[PDB]
Amino acid sequence: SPSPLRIFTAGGTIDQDYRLEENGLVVGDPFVAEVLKTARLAGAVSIVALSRKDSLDFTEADREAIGRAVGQAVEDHILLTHGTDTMVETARYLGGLPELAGKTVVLSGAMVPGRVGGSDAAFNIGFACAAALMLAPGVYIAMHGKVFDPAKTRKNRGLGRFEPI
Amino acid sequence: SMAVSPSPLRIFTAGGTIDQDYRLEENGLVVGDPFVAEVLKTARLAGAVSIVALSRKDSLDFTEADREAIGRAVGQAVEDHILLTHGTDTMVETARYLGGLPELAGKTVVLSGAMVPGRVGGSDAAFNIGFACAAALMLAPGVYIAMHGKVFDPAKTRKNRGLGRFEPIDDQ
Amino acid sequence: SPSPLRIFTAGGTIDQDYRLEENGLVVGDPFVAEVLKTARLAGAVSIVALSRKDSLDFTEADREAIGRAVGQAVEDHILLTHGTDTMVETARYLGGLPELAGKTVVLSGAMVPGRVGGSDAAFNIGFACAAALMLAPGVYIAMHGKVFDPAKTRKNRGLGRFEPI
Amino acid sequence: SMAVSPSPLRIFTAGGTIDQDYRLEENGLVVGDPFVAEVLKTARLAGAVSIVALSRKDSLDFTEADREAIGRAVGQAVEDHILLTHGTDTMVETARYLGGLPELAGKTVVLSGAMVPGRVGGSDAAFNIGFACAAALMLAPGVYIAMHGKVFDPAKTRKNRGLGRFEPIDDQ
Ligand SMILES: [Cl-]
Ligand SMILES: [Cl-]
């Protein structure tokens, strides 16, 4: 085989881990690296860290910086792992950038941290890798085993899911 | 009417390494329950996926009659998006057989599985299930093998039994 | 085989699990039950739920109620899973009760939730079950692969461990 | 002087089910690295435990010379608290052999392992390691089998190979 994939990590629930110092969860090392370590991949992949912030902390300036970072990739297939709180805001922002118009850009993450039992993360990473390879140029959210149009999607905080508007 | 989430994907299971589990009686691994069901249980799916168990035979007892039954089951499915979980040692033989059924011509059929049992630590299984579900939804009609985070053409693929990987057969 | 063991669950980090509604960890179902399900035990065990409170929330009245509950057990071998924040306070309280003087009472738990990767919980449960069977009547803390005297122990919050005073 | 945490327990590993792991080459389980090390890595121990790997032989290739080497290693240890991880099919034979060595008379020696490999989901291994570490520290000198959350007298124990459990031999 497939086209080279570049993966950017912006934090989120997917990456949370337990720390004794905080007596709870903190954004830790990118879980996507753990998943891809055992995926026995054939194709070229590179993983780059952007952020470990809470996605609620992202400003417009942070989304502009994420846009420029995705634009630094020569790869035309991109996965961004991200928190679900503001995944829609980032995805809509990227979808408006003429500079990304040739790329397939998929945002994903997890509702349950990858390091907690019963997580969606590994499935979501496989699904989102396929989506980043196979979908036409555009910006997408891949969650819940489907592909969402960011312009027509919202995060339901109370129900812990993405849904059509 | 209130929105109904479609369920475009059906899954069939034929066993293989992906489903192996330890049994005290055998003092070893046997083909267990379908591991794909465990992965989808926690995937928080928007739709549902019907998972239909076809066979758990050991690779050695898996016959041509068994492959026929798989082709009947895939062709009879209403869904046009199909994932078959299967052993890797004869996945190419099953994929090639399904590619020859004209009844499958409008369906996207993806075969997948795992090199390491899902119930053993460090398994490729969950990644492979996520990737193969997407592939079965997104690829054009045809028969494919989805492994190692890529798509293989069954007519141009072999299994390297030593290394536990699929490899392309290069054109000459 | 061994003498019957009664296990009481009072919550704590050991039992924490991720909930979408809280966007974080909450005290969930007792992890000791998950561990003992696969331990293939020969002996008689019964598990009883007392509390799912944060151990910091326990009052003197709650510790008196825990004492009376342990006293309702005919078993002379007792494990109490508990949060580490006030495990010493509960253990010292129980150690002062003449009514428990014939029982072996062991408190344990985990520094990392059992449902998070890399947890101490399963090891701690095996160790603490053995301790509850094998130690002389008394009240003990079993953590870090050793047995602590509650009267001579403190929880180091900053270092996430129990240590001699 | 500032307090030094003693390390009263030494661990020896002789393989067994507890250590089995999946290998692509064998298309199956082999005796892998010592799983006891994985469990103790995350136990947040106050002391340290030296873990000494003695053997990984398949039960079939495990010989009387191999049992002798285990008795030499346990007797030469400075520690008087010893846990040996081992296969369950011949744990009673090894335990009985060690019980006959006068050099072991002041040591508490516990044998343990797992019915299900540590690297397979749903394994007894971590519980068994915690329980057997405590047992090796708390029991009086002697040789014991610690499994199923209890202590077995090797002279009065058999393995039920069908059920994957140790059972007492009742006195008559
Ligand atoms: Cl938290
Ligand atoms: Cl095997």
Author numbering:
A (entry chain B), C (entry chain B): 4 to 168
B (entry chain A), D (entry chain A): 0 to 171
In the authors' words:
A distinctive feature of RrA is the presence of Lys19 within the lining of the substrate‐binding site. We probed the importance of this residue by mutating it to L‐Ala, L‐Glu, and L‐Gln. Crystals of RrA(K19Q) were grown both in the absence and presence of L‐Asp in the crystallization buffer. However, aspartate could not be modeled in either structure, although some density found in the active sites appeared to represent molecules other than water. Gln19 interacts indirectly with the OH of Tyr21 of an adjacent protomer through a water molecule. There were no disordered regions in the main chain of any protomer, aside from some N‐ and C‐terminal residues. The kinetic data, even when reduced to approximate turnover numbers, demonstrate that Lys19 plays an important role during catalysis and its mutation reduces the rate of catalysis by two or more orders of magnitude.
